[PDB]
RNA sequence: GCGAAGAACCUUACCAGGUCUUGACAUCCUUUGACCACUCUGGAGACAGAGCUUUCCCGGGACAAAGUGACAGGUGGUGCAUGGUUGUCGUCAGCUCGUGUCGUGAGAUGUUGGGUUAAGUCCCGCAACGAGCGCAACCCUUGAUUUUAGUUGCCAGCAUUUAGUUGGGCACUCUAAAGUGACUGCCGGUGCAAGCCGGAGGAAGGUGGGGAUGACGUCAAAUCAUCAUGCCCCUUAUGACCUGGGCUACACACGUGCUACAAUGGAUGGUACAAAGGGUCGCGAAGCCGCGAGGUGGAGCCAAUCCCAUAAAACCAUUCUCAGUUCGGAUUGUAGGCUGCAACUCGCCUACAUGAAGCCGGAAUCGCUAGUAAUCGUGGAUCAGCAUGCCACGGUGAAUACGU
C-alpha cells in the first residue's frame, strides 16, 4: 500500500482540505519544501551533484 | 565518519552548477523538467558515454548540450538521432530544444565514464581486484596525478560483504583547490548491489 | 460552526427525520429543536448505540452521548 | 584547567567613587543582566549609609572590609581515600570574592522590606563590628580553628 | 530616463556584464547612472542528514541574489535602438 | 568622528563652543535618564583636557541604550584625538581608540543556545 | 520535544462495517473516436439509473473510451544477505610509501629518546635520508581601513513641511566588488635552538572570535518505513475503493520543556532604543463597528520605496506593605471570535465568573570559561487552519580556575 497513494496526491478530491503535498520523485509525505516541491532526502541528493543552480553549501 | 561528496562542496567555489537557469517564480514548473529532460536523454544515448548535460534555458526556449566521449554516435554522418531526439525533448519541454553536442579529450579524466569502465565489466563477472587495477594502472598513464576506485558491496559472491579498493599518487580532498571529479554508479549484478565509486584528481 | 451565522445538520439527517427507528450513519449533527421524540442512531466505530433526543440535550452534537474507548476499571 | 594559572578582570571604576570595591560588589549583586537594578540600589544604599552614619559613604563601605575578609579557609584534602578538613591560608582572591559574597549572601538576614537599605544596614552592621556577616567571618575561622 | 535590474546568483557574471552595458551606455550617451550594489536576499534551507533518526545533524544550504540596477538620466534615440541588441550570459536577470 | 560597539553606530562632529553634548536632534538627559552611565561619555574629554571647551553633536543608530554609551564614547574618542595629535598620546592609552570587538553569537544546530546545549541523562 | 519542517477529515500504514477483480495506478493489442464535464433519485459515501452529450488535428499523428490475457499490485518477511545514506570513538592526531641499513625469518628502523605545541606542530640527539593522505594554510562571516558606484539608502552644507516631506548633493553612514592590514614582526630576559615570560605600536597579539572541512578504521551500530535491490510469501487478497473510528485511552514509573512559589515584585498610566527574514494570486494599510478575539474597507507593493510591524526586559510617577496575599495561575460554568463540507471523541484564541498546588524543592544529578551562561522579545520552514518544539536574529550581561 504505498505506489497506490500517489494517484491519491495527484487527484482533485472533493474538499480542497483533503489535498496535500508530496515529494515529486519519491512520493514521501513528510517535509516537503515548496519552493522545490522535493522532500529533504531528494533534495539534498540533488544539491550535491548540482542540478539545483544557485544553491550552494553555507559556511556562513 | 563518512565523507563529504566532493563535487557537492566545490559547487560555487571552483565549479558551477549543472544548470544555468534563472527563474522568477516559476522554479517549481522549470527545476522537475531539469530532472526529467535529464532521464529522457540518460537511457535514449546511454551507451554514448554520455557524462554531462548542463541544461540551460531562457525566452521560452531550453538548450541542453550534451557532452560525450563517443561525439559520432550521437550526431554527424547519420545526421538522424540529433533530429530523432529533438523529437523527444521537445515532445516533453513543449517548447524548442537545441542540442549541441561537445566533445570528450582524455576520456580517462571522466569519472562516469572511467567508473562505467569498471562497471560493466563487474556486471560481466569478472575479478574485483583486477577490475579496478586493471584500468587503475590504465588511467594513470593519461596524466592523472591520482586516483580512487573503490568497490563496495557484497564483492566476490561471498554471503558477508567487504570493501575493496585501490590508489596511485596525490589526491588531496582537504584542499579546495583541487579539480578532483566523483563519481557513483551501479553494478547491477544478478545477485545483489554492489555500487563502485571513483575519483579522479587532475591539473591543479 | 461555533459562530452565531451558523447552525447545520449534515445534509439527510434532518431530511429523514422530517418526514419521520432512524440510524443516522456517521455523527456530528447536532440536534436542533426539531428532533425531540425521534431516536437516532449514530454509530460509534462499532455497533449503534441508540440514544432518544429529548428536550433538555438539544444543542449538543448528536455524537457525545455515544462513548468510544471501553474503560471498565484500570 | 590543567595548565598553569589565569588572572581574572573585574576591572571598571564606577561613577560616583570611582573604585573597584564599588564596581565590585555591584557585579556581585544582580541576576539575569540587571544592572541597572542593581546600581542604583547600590548607590541608593550609600545614600542612606552616608546619612544615618554621618561617615563617607566609601570609608563606611570600606569599614567592613577587614570585618568580613577570611582568613582561613578549611581546605577540603584528600587523605586516606577520603576527604578531610585540612585548614589553609586563603589567597587574595578568596578573601575579596568570599568577602563580598558573605554580604549578598546574607541579605535575606538584615530582615528589611526593600534591598536599598537592606544592603546598607549590613554594611554599617559589619561596619559595627556586629550583625551576621562578620559573625559569618568568625564562624568560618570557628570550623578552621578546630582543624 | 529608463531603468534597467540585474538579478544574478554569481557576483562575477552580473557585476562583469554590468560592466558591457555600463560601456556601451557611455557611447550611446555621457550621462550614465552606472552600475550601484542593494543588499543581497540570502536564504537558509536546514535539511537534515540522517535517513532516520540521530535528530542532531543537519546541513544548512544557502541561495544568495546579487543585485545591481542601472539607469539613465537624459538619455537620446540610441537608448532604445542599442540597448536591446544585446543578450547577457545565461543567469543574468534583465528589466528595463 | 565614527564609533561602533555591538549593533549601534554613533557618528560624532565636534566643534569648539559651550559643552552642550546634544545627542540625536534631542537633550542628552533626555535622551539618556541615567546620568551616570553618561560620565563616561566624557572620558574622552576629561583625560585630555577638553571638558566643556566643545559642543558634541551626535547622531544615533541602533543597538541598545547601553549600545550606544560604547560608542559615542569611541565615536568622539576618534575626533578628539584628530582635532590635535596631542591628545592620541593619552587617548591611545586609556583604551578609547580601541573598538571594543565582542559581539553576539551564532546559534549551532544541536544546540538549545550558541553554546549551551540540551540537558544530559545516562541511565 | 526521537523519523513526524504541522495526527479533526486527508495524511494513516491500524480497527469495524460496506464494496472491486487485467484491478485505482504502467507497457503489449484490437473495435471506437479527442474522452470529459452537467442535472434528477437513492443511499454514509464508495457506486447504480436516466438525458444533452465531449463539435480531434494533419492514410498518418498526440489523448481517450470499451474488449481477454503478459501482467500488474504489496509501508508483507530477512538491515546477521546488500547498494546506499548515516551516526559515535572524534576534528581525537594518527595511517603509510620509496631508496638505504639490521634480522636465516615473519619483521624492525624511519614514526623510539630530551624539550615544545592546539597537533608525528617544531627543534636537538641518533642507521637513516626523504615523501603521500591526515594537522596547519587555501574558503565563509565578524572586528579597522583605500578606491570604485551613489538609489529606493544617507542629509552636513542651503533653505523649505505635521513629518527626509520638496528642490538639491553623494560630505558623513550604509550597501558591495576589487585591495591593505597580524607574521612572535620589533625590544628585554631565558633557551643552543624550538619555544616560553614581559613591553611598544596597532582597530585587532600570540591559530583575534566563530563556521564549513571529519584520515586508517570500530561497533554484524541505525534504517528493506525515502529511493533501489538478492531471496521468500500473498496475487478473487497480506492487493484496491469509502464512511466512521483509533493514532490524543489512564490506576501508575521514567526523559526533555513551559509557568510559578513574590518587594531586584505586582497593579495603573506615560514612555525610549533592535537585528535578521517573508510577501502575487500573496502581504494586506487608513477610516468605520466593536471591552473583546475580530468583521467591513481597500491604499501601497513583483519591494534598500509599500506591507507583515506598536518588540518586550529597561525607565519615570501613584498605589500595594510581607498575607496561599493586590503572587500564582490550573480547573470548571456561561457567553463569544477565526478556518474549514465539519472543531462531539479531538483545534487556536477573547470577556465575565470560578479560583486549586506552590511559600525555593531529599539522597542524587545537568550545562556552561565571555558577549559565555541567565533572562526578555522577533522571524522562517511545514502550514485552509493549529508549536511551551525545531531552525535563525537581536536587547540586558555576570561568577571562579590554587590544582590533577
Ligand atoms: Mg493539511
Ligand atoms: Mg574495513
Ligand atoms: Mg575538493
Ligand atoms: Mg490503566
Ligand atoms: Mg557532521
Ligand atoms: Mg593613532
Ligand atoms: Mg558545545
Ligand atoms: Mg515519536
Ligand atoms: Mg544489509
Ligand atoms: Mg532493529
Ligand atoms: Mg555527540
Ligand atoms: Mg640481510
Ligand atoms: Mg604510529
Ligand atoms: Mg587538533
Ligand atoms: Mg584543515
Ligand atoms: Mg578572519
Ligand atoms: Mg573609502
Ligand atoms: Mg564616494
Ligand atoms: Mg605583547
Ligand atoms: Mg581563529
Ligand atoms: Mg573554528
Ligand atoms: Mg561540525
Ligand atoms: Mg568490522
Ligand atoms: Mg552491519
Ligand atoms: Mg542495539
Ligand atoms: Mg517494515
Ligand atoms: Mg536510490
Ligand atoms: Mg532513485
Ligand atoms: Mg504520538
Ligand atoms: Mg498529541
Ligand atoms: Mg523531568
Ligand atoms: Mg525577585
Ligand atoms: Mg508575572
Ligand atoms: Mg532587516
Ligand atoms: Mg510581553
Ligand atoms: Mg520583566
Ligand atoms: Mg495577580
Ligand atoms: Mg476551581
Ligand atoms: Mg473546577
Ligand atoms: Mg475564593
Ligand atoms: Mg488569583
Ligand atoms: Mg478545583
Ligand atoms: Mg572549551
Ligand atoms: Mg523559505
Ligand atoms: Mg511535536
Ligand atoms: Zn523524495
Redesign the interface.
Given at each position: 500500500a504505498k505506489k497506490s497513494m500517489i494517484a491519491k496526491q495527484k487527484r482533485t478530491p472533493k474538499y480542497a482540505v483533503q489535498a496535500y503535498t508530496r515529494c515529486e520523485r519519491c512520493g514521501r509525505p513528510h517535509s516537503v519544501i515548496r519552493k522545490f516541491k522535493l522532500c529533504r532526502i531528494c533534495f539534498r541528493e540533488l544539491a550535491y551533484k548540482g542540478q539545483i543552480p544557485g544553491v550552494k553549501k553555507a559556511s556562513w | 565518519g563518512q565523507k563529504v561528496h566532493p563535487i557537492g562542496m566545490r559547487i560555487g567555489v571552483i565549479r558551477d552548477w549543472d544548470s544555468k537557469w534563472y527563474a522568477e517564480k516559476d522554479y517549481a514548473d522549470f527545476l522537475h523538467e531539469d530532472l526529467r529532460i535529464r532521464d529522457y536523454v540518460a537511457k535514449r544515448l546511454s551507451d554514448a558515454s554520455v557524462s554531462r548535460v548542463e541544461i540551460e534555458r531562457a525566452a521560452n526556449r531550453v538548450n541542453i548540450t550534451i557532452h560525450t566521449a563517443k561525439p559520432g554516435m550521437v550526431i554527424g554522418k547519420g545526421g538522424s538521432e540529433v533530429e530523432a531526439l529533438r523529437k523527444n525533448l521537445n515532445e516533453l519541454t513543449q517548447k524548442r530544444v537545441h542540442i549541441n553536442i561537445v566533445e570528450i579529450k582524455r576520456a580517462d579524466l571522466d569519472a562516469k565514464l572511467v567508473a562505467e569502465n569498471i562497471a560493466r565489466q563487474l556486471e560481466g563477472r569478472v575479478s574485483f581486484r583486477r577490475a579496478q587495477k586493471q584500468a587503475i594502472q590504465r588511467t594513470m598513464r593519461a596524466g592523472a596525478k591520482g586516483i580512487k576506485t573503490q568497490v563496495s558491496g557484497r564483492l566476490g559472491g561471498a554471503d558477508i560483504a567487504r570493501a575493496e579498493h585501490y590508489s596511485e599518487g596525490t589526491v588531496p580532498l582537504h584542499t579546495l583547490r583541487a579539480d578532483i571529479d566523483y563519481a557513483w554508479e551501479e553494478a547491477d549484478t544478478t545477485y545483489g548491489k554492489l555500487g563502485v565509486k571513483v575519483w579522479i584528481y587532475r591539473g591543479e | 460552526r461555533s459562530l452565531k451565522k451558523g447552525p447545520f445538520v449534515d445534509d439527510h439527517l434532518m431530511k429523514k427525520v422530517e418526514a419521520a427507528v432512524i440510524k443516522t450513519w456517521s455523527r456530528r449533527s447536532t440536534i436542533f429543536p426539531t428532533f425531540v421524540g425521534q431516536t437516532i442512531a449514530v454509530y460509534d466505530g462499532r455497533k449503534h448505540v441508540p440514544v432518544y433526543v429529548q428536550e433538555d440535550m438539544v444543542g449538543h452534537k448528536l455524537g457525545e452521548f455515544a462513548p468510544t474507548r471501553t474503560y471498565r476499571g484500570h | 584547567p590543567r595548565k598553569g594559572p589565569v588572572a581574572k578582570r573585574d576591572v571598571l571604576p564606577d561613577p560616583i567613587y570611582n573604585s573597584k570595591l564599588v564596581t565590585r560588589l555591584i557585579n556581585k549583586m544582580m541576576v539575569d543582566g540587571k544592572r541597572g537594578k542593581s546600581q542604583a540600589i547600590l548607590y541608593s544604599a550609600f545614600d542612606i549609609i552616608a546619612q544615618e552614619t554621618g561617615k563617607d559613604p566609601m570609608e563606611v563601605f570600606e569599614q567592613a572590609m577587614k570585618n568580613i575578609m577570611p582568613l582561613l579557609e578549611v581546605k577540603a584534602r584528600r587523605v586516606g581515600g577520603a576527604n578531610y578538613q585540612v585548614p589553609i591560608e586563603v589567597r587574595a582572591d578568596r578573601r575579596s570574592t568570599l568577602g563580598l559574597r558573605w554580604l549578598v549572601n546574607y541579605a535575606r538576614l538584615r530582615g528589611e522590606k526593600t534591598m536599598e537599605v537592606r544592603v546598607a544596614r549590613e554594611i554599617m552592621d559589619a561596619a559595627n563590628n556586629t550583625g551576621a556577616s562578620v559573625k559569618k567571618r568568625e564562624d568560618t575561622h570557628k570550623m578552621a580553628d578546630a582543624n | 530616463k529608463i531603468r534597467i535590474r540585474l538579478k544574478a546568483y554569481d557576483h562575477r557574471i552580473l557585476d562583469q556584464s554590468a560592466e558591457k552595458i555600463v560601456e556601451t551606455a557611455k557611447r550611446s550617451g555621457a550621462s550614465v547612472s552606472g552600475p550601484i550594489p542593494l543588499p543581497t536576499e540570502k536564504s537558509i534551507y536546514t535539511v537534515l542528514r540522517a535517513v532516520h533518526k540521530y535528530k542532531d545533524s543537519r546541513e544548512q544550504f544557502e541561495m544568495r541574489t546579487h543585485k545591481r540596477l542601472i539607469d539613465i538620466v537624459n538619455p537620446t534615440p540610441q537608448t532604445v535602438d542599442s540597448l536591446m541588441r544585446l543578450d547577457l550570459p545565461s543567469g543574468v536577470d534583465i528589466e528595463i | 568622528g565614527t564609533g561602533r560597539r555591538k549593533s549601534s553606530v554613533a557618528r560624532v562632529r565636534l566643534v569648539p563652543g559651550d559643552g552642550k553634548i546634544v545627542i540625536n536632534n534631542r537633550d542628552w538627559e533626555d535622551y539618556i535618564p541615567?546620568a551616570?552611565?553618561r560620565?563616561?561619555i566624557k572620558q574622552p574629554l576629561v583625560a585630555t583636557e577638553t571638558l566643556g571647551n566643545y559642543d558634541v553633536l551626535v547622531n544615533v543608530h541602533g543597538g541598545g541604550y547601553?549600545g550606544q554609551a560604547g560608542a559615542i564614547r569611541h565615536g568622539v574618542a576618534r575626533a578628539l584625538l584628530q582635532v590635535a595629535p596631542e591628545y592620541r598620546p593619552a587617548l591611545k592609552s586609556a583604551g578609547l581608540l580601541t573598538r571594543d570587538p565582542r559581539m553576539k553569537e551564532?546559534k549551532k544546530?544541536?544546540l538549545k543556545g550558541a553554546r549551551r546545549a540540551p540537558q544530559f541523562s545516562k541511565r
Open positions: - | - | - | - | - | 541615567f551616570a552611565l560620565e563616561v547601553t551564532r544546530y544541536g
